[PDB]
Design a protein around this ligand. Structure first.
Ligand SMILES: [Mg+2]
Ligand SMILES: [Mg+2]
Ligand SMILES: [Mg+2]
Ligand SMILES: [Mg+2]
Ligand SMILES: [Mg+2]
Ligand SMILES: [Mg+2]
Ligand SMILES: [Mg+2]
Ligand SMILES: [Mg+2]
Ligand SMILES: [Zn+2]
Lengths: 138, 48, 41, 98, 157, 180, 154
RNA sequence: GUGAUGCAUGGCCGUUUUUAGUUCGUGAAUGAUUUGUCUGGUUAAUUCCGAUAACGAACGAGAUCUUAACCUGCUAAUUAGCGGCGAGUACACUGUACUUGCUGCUUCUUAGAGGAACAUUGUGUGUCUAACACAAGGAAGUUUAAGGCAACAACAGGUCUGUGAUGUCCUUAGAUGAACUAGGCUGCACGCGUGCUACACUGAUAUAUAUAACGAGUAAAAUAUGCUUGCAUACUUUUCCUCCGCCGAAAGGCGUAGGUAAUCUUUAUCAAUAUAUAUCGUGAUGGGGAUAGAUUAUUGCAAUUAUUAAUCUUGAACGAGGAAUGCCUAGUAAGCAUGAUUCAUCAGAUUGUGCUGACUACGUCCCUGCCCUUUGUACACA
């Protein structure tokens, strides 16, 4: 019927509601036709390509993204999609198919199912960044 | 007497009347050294 | 120095190299031919 | 009902107690909702003087605001509130229909 | 009407002030308290508003004021602490002290953990500056209390 | 079907080094459609071997302070270069890149005396050299970066000492020879 | 230019299913064709915001701006002048001192809004907050978007 | 007393040192002392193992604390959402986008308690000891990442210009006290710091598009009455964040609105790098914005030696930097901004926070600095 999972890259949680439908796939109120830059577009479409466009004619998808920059957001979206489709399959479709899909995803790469755990480390005094200290002249 | 209402010399530390280096956030109005000593009693614990 | 002019396998750089021209002029030429980086044949 | 406090564990205990009190009878009590802990951070420079590689220290007074709802009469709610309690947890009861 | 953050800070400040007031008043007392002859104190507070370490420190200061042989006094204090069931202690006295220049004197008995949040928890610490002949003597007392269990121990039955 | 840039498939590519194959993985899981991977390539010693070569190239391009942390731009530039390669000097751009990489590594280096070079290191050097040369070509010229880069790549593929990287490599080799 | 083989169908119904810049351009063109909106007086020698230190260089920038504003309105429930200004902010290089963010010149925006309301595209709502789209205007926008989509398909 | 003296002191802070170091009980070896606390292996670590005139302790390390990392599809549901569903406005097919009105789920949003990695299983190297390397699993395998805490002993380190912590000496009405009026700390042949901005085309310019996280936000003025711009009397919003609506090129102004805050500023987006499309076209060039000239404001009793801000114009040095030297190993460098602290006003500072996300190690003692054993010393102020 309807399944809600998230992605996560840096801060940037893309929540993918995957429902029964005709196969549209959207972001907040906009088609995945947009995303934003033409270069990165492939990182969002990739899981779909892996799984096949015919498999998602049963499944509508909406995605709510919040927080983060651009690339991170894209990554989050991708992650959400990956988790989402697979989650749907695990519940309402068969198990074998789900397994197959998972295998395919693994063969392509990590990041689709399992998350990127990295996050901005606290800046420390005596410097501008995390490690980068100021400057001594003696 | 001359306007003593808005400037560094207008107000002071609650504790020792020093016009320099006052923590003026949250209306604490303690010069920072004094605050550093009384940070325990006020309930300011260093975690990170 | 190389004071290129204005009054008189397609890319702007190539055009510049060949006839000794400003790249705005190259762009213009390209446009004419057709009729932020470029590629034409 | 809003329970503002500085000490987490104590606050939690208080909340638990109030829940227990509620569970007696007559109280449609919504569960304890802990609010976003708006942490007062002061970054003071250590050392009175200007000597030593200027180490700061991030103090954090982290206030825990806690929130809980009920559909009741004033006296009863007052009674419920009376768990004895002490100077540490700051209580406020709102007796509004809205 | 005043905000929550503002309120909390104010309360803290008030607490601090109260503590300081108590310190000022009660040189003759085993002071720790802070929970609200005494009538005057109450009045003062109203006007304003609209085993333990601190006590030990105070005692030490009093002794110093009286005029003892210092070391002996410290020893006595240590003994008292031991009697009162302390797992460990530490007293420091730095300042002028007999000679003109320098001279910090440690006085430990039982073991005194210094690093970790255990230190923060399981020691009571106190600092008094006893004014004397030609300057100030600088007390710091540090008591390790009975634990509610230390992180280092692994007690097999 | 598995693809890169929705254009150059790298099922057609070839290698013929062994060592370089071992070093750079353009494989079954190092398949990629656009360079930008957020991979954890530097949490281990040899995890940079799993890294796709395009990504590496992009990273290399990314250098120089005022242009640093501009991944997208770099990617775009590389795409442009690839396109150029495809069009003018007609060949599968991936193959050309591979050839360049093969060419690029100085096989022997000097030290405080002459020693050999690990394949991965050589590859890295090649990647660096090609980008640096391209940058140099760009800087205060006019030409454009993508074009220059493409030219450099082609030169590398050829194995001709008109470009900078190749020259540098040659020099290094000479030095090594002199040493031992 | 934009078109490509995608793995889904696109419900080309509202403007959120259209590519932005192109749409804006189209709207500007339409406006020009109509002569529905003017170009006040000061428009032709003003600077759009503190940070720009230079005139637009687009000739019919006003129209473009208006189009953008429409889109913005459609996107959000109730949108002020301040919000609009914030939206059309850029980096102001203060020469030697490092860059700050720079709030746009709001006057022009306000004028545009006024014009739109006169024409009957936007609506100052007495409930809620500052000026949203008026329903007719929204409908028109949607229609335009649809048209654009059709054109693209063709 | 922001007088003199930190070489009189207190406390606090710095460094030695975030390294691994310090000490005791008894024993043993005229005395200072040594041993323990070590040839070696191992460790981030006097971290362990193993050898042993030592055995056994204690502080320090480790543990602990705080975050950040992934789960309970258990605990909870506003001031968070998701749906539920009415009401529509547009368009699709035989649902999608968008607002007003009403009120099961907890994935996202908040935050309490729990869980999870221990080198677990696999295989190497290792006295097959302590342990390391690789592989699989996994959210995670450098105590997972980051801090915080900080022993012993000092330095004649800093601070009496933080203090009504504080000694002595000075000063005490022609005060070195306090108060007021200017002026100066910003004065400039020059030397050395920390930064910012640059030297362009991976770029400026100008439109358009995209999208953060931590945050932080409440004596003076207005209007009327009574008298000579002043006082007195009465009465009520304003003192900070600014929504919004109007005026203003711009800055700002005026009017009002919410907010003592998960409610409002505002946060299903407050930023810039981004990206897309145009103008430039390598020419001190539209790179660059110094220096200057003249207004319009705002803050303030007061703006000149221009507070800052805006508008117009002025178009300097600089074509990547010599001798030297700094910082850095993964969400790090760098770039990009931005919140907060100071704040009446004013970031080029600091301090936090995020966004774009490299290169190169994965080691070594060559330099530099610490530490260790041996060794030498006429040094011990070392
Ligand atoms: Mg310990
Ligand atoms: Mg000293
Ligand atoms: Mg020894
Ligand atoms: Mg520790
Ligand atoms: Mg000065
Ligand atoms: Mg400063
Ligand atoms: Mg050095
Ligand atoms: Mg001697
Ligand atoms: Zn003070």
């Amino acid at each position: 019927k309807r399944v809600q999972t998230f992605g996560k890259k840096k801060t940037a949680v893309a929540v993918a509601t995957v429902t029964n439908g005709k196969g549209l796939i959207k972001l907040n109120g906009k088609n995945l036709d947009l995303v934003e830059p033409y270069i990165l577009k492939t990182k969002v479409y990739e899981p779909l390509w892996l799984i096949g466009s015919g498999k998602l004619k049963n499944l509508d998808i909406r995605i709510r993204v919040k927080g983060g920059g651009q690339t991170s957001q894209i990554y989050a979206i991708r992650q959400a999609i990956g988790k989402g489709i697979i989650s749907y399959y695990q519940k309402y479709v068969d198990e074998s198919t789900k397994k197959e899909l998972k295998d395919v995803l693994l063969r392509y790469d990590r990041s689709l199912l399992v998350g990127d755990t990295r996050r901005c480390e606290p800046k420390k005094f005596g410097g501008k960044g995390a490690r980068a200290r100021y400057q001594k002249s003696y | 007497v001359h306007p003593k209402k808005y400037g560094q010399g207008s107000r002071q530390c609650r504790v020792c009347s020093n016009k320099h280096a006052i923590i003026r956030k949250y209306n604490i109005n303690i010069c920072r050294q004094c605050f550093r000593e009384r940070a325990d009693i006020i309930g300011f614990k260093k975690y990170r | 120095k190389l004071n290129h002019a204005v009054f008189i396998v397609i890319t702007p750089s190539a055009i510049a190299e060949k006839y000794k021209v400003n790249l705005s002029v190259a762009r213009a030429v390209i446009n004419h031919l057709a009729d932020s980086q470029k590629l034409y044949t | 009902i809003a329970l503002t406090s500085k000490n987490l564990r104590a606050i939690e205990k208080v909340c638990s107690d109030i829940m227990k009190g509620a569970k007696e009878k007559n109280l449609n009590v919504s569960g304890p909702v802990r609010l976003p802990v708006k942490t007062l951070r002061i970054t003071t420079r250590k050392s009175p003087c200007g000597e030593g590689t200027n180490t700061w220290d991030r103090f954090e007074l982290r206030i825990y605001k806690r929130l809980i709802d009920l559909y009741s009469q004033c006296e009863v709610v007052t009674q419920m509130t009376s768990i004895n309690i002490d100077p540490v947890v700051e209580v406020e009861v709102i007796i509004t229909d809205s | 009407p005043i905000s929550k953050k503002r309120k909390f800070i104010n309360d803290g400040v008030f607490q601090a002030e109260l503590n300081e007031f108590l310190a000022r008043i009660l040189a003759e007392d085993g002071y720790s308290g802070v929970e609200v002859r005494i009538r005057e104190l109450t009045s003062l507070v109203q006007k304003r508003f609209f085993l333990c370490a601190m006590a030990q420190a105070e005692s030490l200061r009093y002794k110093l004021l009286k005029g003892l042989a210092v070391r002996r006094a410290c020893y006595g204090v240590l003994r008292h602490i031991m009697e009162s069931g302390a797992k460990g202690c530490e007293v420091i006295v730095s300042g002028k002290l007999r000679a003109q220049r320098a001279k910090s004197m440690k006085f430990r008995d039982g073991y005194l953990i210094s690093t970790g949040e255990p230190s923060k928890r399981f020691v009571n610490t106190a600092t008094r500056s006893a004014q004397l002949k030609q300057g100030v003597l600088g007390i710091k007392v540090k008591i390790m209390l009975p634990t509610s269990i230390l992180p280092d121990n692994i007690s097999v039955l | 079907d598995i693809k890169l840039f929705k254009k150059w498939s790298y099922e057609e590519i070839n290698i013929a080094d062994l060592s370089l194959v071992d070093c750079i993985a353009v494989s079954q899981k190092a398949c990629v459609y656009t360079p930008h991977t957020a991979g954890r390539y530097q949490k281990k010693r040899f995890r940079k071997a799993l890294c796709p070569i395009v990504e590496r190239l992009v990273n290399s391009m990314m250098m120089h302070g005022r242009n640093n942390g501009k991944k997208l731009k770099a990617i775009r530039i590389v795409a442009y270069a690839f396109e150029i390669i495809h069009l003018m000097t007609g060949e599968n751009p991936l193959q050309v890149f591979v050839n360049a990489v093969q060419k690029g590594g100085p096989r022997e280096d000097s030290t405080r005396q002459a020693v050999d070079v690990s394949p991965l290191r050589r590859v890295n050097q090649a990647i660096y050299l090609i980008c640096t040369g391209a940058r140099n070509a760009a800087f205060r010229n006019i030409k454009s970066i993508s074009e220059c880069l493409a030219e450099e790549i082609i030169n590398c593929a050829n194995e001709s000492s008109s470009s900078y990287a190749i020259k540098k490599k040659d020099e290094i080799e000479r030095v090594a020879k002199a040493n031992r | 230019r934009l078109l490509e083989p995608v793995p889904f169908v696109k419900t080309n119904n509202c403007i959120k299913d259209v590519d932005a810049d192109l749409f804006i351009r189209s709207y500007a063109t339409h406006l020009k064709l109509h002569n529905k909106i003017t170009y006040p007086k000061w428009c032709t020698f003003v600077k759009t915001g503190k940070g720009r230190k230079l005139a637009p260089l687009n000739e019919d920038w006003y129209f473009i701006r208006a189009s953008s504003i429409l889109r913005r309105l459609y996107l959000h429930p109730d949108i002020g002048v301040g919000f609009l200004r914030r939206q059309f902010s850029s980096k102001q290089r203060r020469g030697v001192a490092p860059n700050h963010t720079s709030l746009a010149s709001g006057k022009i925006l306000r004028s545009i809004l006024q014009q739109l309301e006169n024409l009957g595209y936007v609506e100052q709502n007495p409930k809620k907050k500052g000026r949203r789209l008026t329903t007719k205007g929204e409908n028109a926008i949607n229609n335009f978007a649809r048209y654009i989509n059709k054109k693209v398909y063709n």
